[PDB]
Design a protein around this ligand. Sequence first.
Ligand SMILES: [Ca+2]
Ligand SMILES: [Ca+2]
Length: 295
Amino acid sequence: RESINPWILTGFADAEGSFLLRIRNNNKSSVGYSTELGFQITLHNKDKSILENIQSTWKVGVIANSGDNAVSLKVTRFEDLKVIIDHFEKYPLITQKLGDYKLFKQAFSVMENKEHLKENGIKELVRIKAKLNWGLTDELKKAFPENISKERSLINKNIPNFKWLAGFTSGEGYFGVNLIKSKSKLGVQVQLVFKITQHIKDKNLMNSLITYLGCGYIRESNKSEFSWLNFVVTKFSDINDKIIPVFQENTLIGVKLEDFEDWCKVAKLIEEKKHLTESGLDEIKKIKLNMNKGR
DNA sequence: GGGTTTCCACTTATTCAGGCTTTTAG
DNA sequence: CCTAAAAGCCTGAATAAGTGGAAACC
Ligand SMILES: [Ca+2]
Ligand SMILES: [Ca+2]
């Protein structure tokens, strides 16, 4: 169907994309390892069309099921990777994932000169993979004995524009309708909530949201051993006047679009004080039921 | 052809999205 | 007293990242 604005695309990849470099034991390879390089996105089935539009925008990649409930877009065909490079050179990433892209590129050149079929290029590919995503396996590090660094330059870049923010929010954003139960007359207080979730490795980027959007807080949550951040807006006037207009102008993608539109219906109802009426409260309840999980 | 590339079927760990309730502001 | 905003959690799962297997190519 329709193509995706390239800056929205980059934001969405900052959210959901990942670069891949496979260094696999291969009895039939002159150096004992074969390699595969690429970029991929894995989403719930409900958003297959997103992956289709990306496929249509770049004219690369392969779409396949990924279990019962996910579907993926994988670009590993070597020449097609040039498209990938050309995109992220012209519309660059800004999360720590940019580091991963910079390693992707570095592997590309190694495989472009065909060095990956010789001892030296394979060794270089191990030294690149050591710093990419989750790094080397135990058996792969024990098979290239040398002292290989895993550390890398932290990325520290600013939000480039509202298109990137629409892509990244389409990925990580949350448009909630919180029904605050109260033993009161009307009972439920309606509270529109905006969240963007992201790991602490990108603190400064989340921080910048406060000033980039002119509203919100940054709060930490955790689960036993892990911790992540939320950018949160709950003051209604920030939402109706600063948050909604931004995504009015820079339209979101995936089913999350429908969640934002519904969120906007309830936000208008709230502007008209109609959430203070049983009539209203009820229409809001119905709207919340068929949005997000209820959809 | 024999290495090597590309594609499919699938799996795992965990950071997201999503949701509650209670407490505080103003 | 009344409603709005914020604090305080807590999970399930959609992500991120990864693998085995083999067809297909060059
Ligand atoms: Ca992400
Ligand atoms: Ca998402």
